[PDB]
């Protein structure tokens, strides 16, 4: 079942120098400076927007401003305005400047600047004095050119014991990589973790919380703002779940004679699922005795002969047929893309570029708007994730061309989406199948 | 006043009739001096008449003090609000959203003294709200000519009564536009329940002399 592991030292160093591309080699836990979680919660509850992007709507307290015009407590004459009190100061320690706080968190005060000697390559010794800091002491007051007084007792002070660590490996082995494993916070600091799922690892979460833009346009900035908004709103609605009594599906089906397990190739299973979905929808439309409609295997419901006598009022689905059509269209599209890959497509990085465009199309091309308009949240998420990559991918030689990118986050979001929305369609089919098969 | 009704705990600026005419540099300067002056003047005048015959209620009244600390000076007559401040005695920001500035010249000296910045009061605003809501609820059979006539009556009630202030109240203009759009709702939706896209206003702004309605409009109806 591939439960937890126990990794070795250099096995992690090799993976670390591989993943050095997608990683943050600026380990201090201080460069955030109230662009972290707690500062965002404080910016929300205080109703002031940090310039990082997350400008939320206020809390339940809908008080905007102008509580009083000119009190003796807030008079402009009796103030020594030597400098301004911006929003950053109000976010740092809000209980002082913020008038009437409520539901506020605090942020750490990490002065210990994480020092480290990032060497060049693993040819130098382990403990090499990098000419980086300063002279050692530049001392000249020490004056011990002559011998010391502790001589008689020194001769009377033998060393009747073996040395400390004379039988040691000269403290110079494959250990500097072991030291570097320490500062790798999440991945490599853990030497024996636990079996984690593929989509759980975002591979992009560490980018949009490090002040990426340094002159980038409004697009990337609004993108990172939206991503941080989703991130913080996810952090809020997080209560420990403990319920459901461990109810599992696809565990009792195999016990009955309505299921059989098999080991069939993935493309085969995908084509099987697509054909099964088309067969189900075709049998649905055929049970309704509508002999003038056709899905066309791209799941684009096509008319035949301009049904306009009393038929256009008979085919106004609107709700679930629309949505199941969109979902199966997306699924069959991905499957057929990978079928063309196996069937002699471009076969290069063009594949992954196509997948990126396919998630863009699910944003725009795939017609799922009508059944559910809440899609636009995750579609703006995907469209912001897009420019999150190109300004990290199309940097340097690649400056204009179509970066094929990756679906590390897109596919992840759509997986979470379908996982959350499976029960809605279960309910809608339970409500609809009885109407087309039992009564009304 | 302190002998008759003291307020040692600073509970004298608690309940005070203040106006929403930009209370950042125009509300009453709620200092310990002007507030107490206003309250004690109100009570002194209340002490004159008997409370049985009549008595000005503070919850319905409104004071407006003026000193070295309170340069703003509010009015609320039967119509629209008003605020006056001098032109050569450390005037305020003088926003002047519209072209409403009353160069109150000196009677004898003939020199610019003040600028009585006006603003439509909330009472007339609520009256207009009620009028628009009553017109919207007048549906079912009402011919559109009568509706346009009623709205023209409402607008020439609002406009031509106060003109300098109708432009100074940005909320007033925004609400006029919203009300015109609300009338267009069922002025275009009365025919077919679609709420279409373009639908030019020329179906309305043609007067009845040619056949149309005569909707004397104020909001930007871009043709």
């Amino acid at each position: 079942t591939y439960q937890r592991w126990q990794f070795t030292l250099p096995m992690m160093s090799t993976l670390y120098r591989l993943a050095n591309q997608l990683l943050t080699d600026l380990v201090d836990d201080n460069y955030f400076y109230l662009f972290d979680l707690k500062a965002f919660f404080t910016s929300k509850a205080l109703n002031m927007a940090i310039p990082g992007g997350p400008k939320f709507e206020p809390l339940v307290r809908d008080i905007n401003l102008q509580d009083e015009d000119w009190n003796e407590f807030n008079d402009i004459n009796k103030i020594i305005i030597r400098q301004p009190i911006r929003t950053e100061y109000k976010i740092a320690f809000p209980y002082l400047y913020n008038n009437l706080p409520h539901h506020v968190h605090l942020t750490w005060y990490h002065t210990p600047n994480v020092v480290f000697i990032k060497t060049e390559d693993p040819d130098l010794p382990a403990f090499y004095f990098d000419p980086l800091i300063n002279p050692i002491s530049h001392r000249h007051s020490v004056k011990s050119q002559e011998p010391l007084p502790d001589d008689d007792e020194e001769f009377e002070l033998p060393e009747f014991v073996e040395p400390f660590l004379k039988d040691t490996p000269l403290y110079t082995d494959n250990t500097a990589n072991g030291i570097a494993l320490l500062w790798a916070p999440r991945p490599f600091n853990l030497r024996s973790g636990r079996t984690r799922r593929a989509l759980d690892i975002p591979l992009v979460k560490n980018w949009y919380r490090e002040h990426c833009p340094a002159g980038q346009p409004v697009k990337v900035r609004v993108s990172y703002q939206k991503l941080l908004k989703y991130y913080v709103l996810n952090a809020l609605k997080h209560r420990p779940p403990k319920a459901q009594k461990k109810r599992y599906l696809f565990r009792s089906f195999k016990a009955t004679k309505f299921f059989q397990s098999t080991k069939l190739d993935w493309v085969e299973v995908g084509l099987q699922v697509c054909r099964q979905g088309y067969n189900m929808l075709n049998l649905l439309i055929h049970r309704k005795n509508l002999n003038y409609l056709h899905l066309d295997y791209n799941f684009n419901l096509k008319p035949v002969k301009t049904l306009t006598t009393k038929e256009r009022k008979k085919s106004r689905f609107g709700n679930a047929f629309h949505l199941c059509r969109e979902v199966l269209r997306l699924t069959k599209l991905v499957v057929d893309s990978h079928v063309q890959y196996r069937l002699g497509n471009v076969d290069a990085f063009q594949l992954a570029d196509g997948l990126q465009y396919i998630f863009a199309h699910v944003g725009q091309l795939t017609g799922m708007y009508r059944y559910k308009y809440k899609l636009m949240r995750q579609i703006r998420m995907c469209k912001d994730l897009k420019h999150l990559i190109y300004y990290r991918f199309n940097t340097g030689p690649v400056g204009k061309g179509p970066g094929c990118g990756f679906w590390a986050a897109g596919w992840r979001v759509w997986l979470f989406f379908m996982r959350g929305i499976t029960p809605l369609l279960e309910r809608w089919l339970g409500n609809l199948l009885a109407r087309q098969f039992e009564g009304r | 006043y302190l002998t008759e009704h003291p307020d040692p705990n600073n509970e004298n600026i608690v309940g005070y009739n203040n106006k929403k005419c930009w209370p950042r540099d125009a509300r009453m300067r709620l200092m310990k001096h002007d507030v107490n002056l206003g309250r004690a003047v109100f009570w002194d005048i209340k002490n004159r008449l008997p409370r049985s015959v009549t008595t000005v209620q503070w919850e319905n009244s409104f004071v407006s003090v003026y000193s070295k600390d309170n340069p703003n000076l509010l009015f609320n007559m039967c119509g629209f609000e008003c605020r006056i401040l001098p032109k050569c005695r450390t005037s305020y920001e003088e926003f002047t959203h519209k072209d409403g500035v009353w160069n109150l010249q000196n009677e004898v000296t003939k020199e610019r003294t003040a600028q009585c910045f006006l603003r439509v009061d909330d009472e007339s605003m609520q009256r207009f709200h009620n009028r628009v809501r009553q017109i919207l609820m007048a549906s079912g059979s009402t011919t559109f000519t009568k509706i346009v006539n009623k709205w023209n009556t409402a607008l020439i009630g609002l406009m031509t009564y106060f003109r300098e202030a109708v432009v100074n109240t940005q909320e007033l203009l925004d609400l006029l536009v919203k009300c015109e759009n609300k009338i267009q709702t069922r002025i275009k939706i009365g025919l077919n329940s679609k709420m279409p896209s373009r639908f030019p206003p020329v179906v309305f702004y043609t007067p009845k002399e040619l056949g149309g309605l005569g909707m004397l409009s104020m909001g930007h109806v871009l043709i």
């Binding site: 927007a49 992007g53 400008k55 409004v218 697009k219 900035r221 609004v222 703002q225 308009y373 636009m376 | 940005q170 203009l173 925004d174 536009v177 759009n181 709702t185 709420m195 896209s197 909001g219 930007h220 871009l222």
Partner: peptide, 27 residues
């Protein structure tokens, strides 16, 4: 879009009685 959409009073996204969205890339 032929219009200027700047001379308008404050803003007009759509008066079609459906303005669920709220955004204009100000931030």
């Amino acid at each position: 879009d032929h219009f200027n959409k700047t001379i308008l009073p404050k803003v007009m996204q759509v008066k079609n009685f459906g303005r669920s969205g709220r955004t204009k890339y100000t931030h």
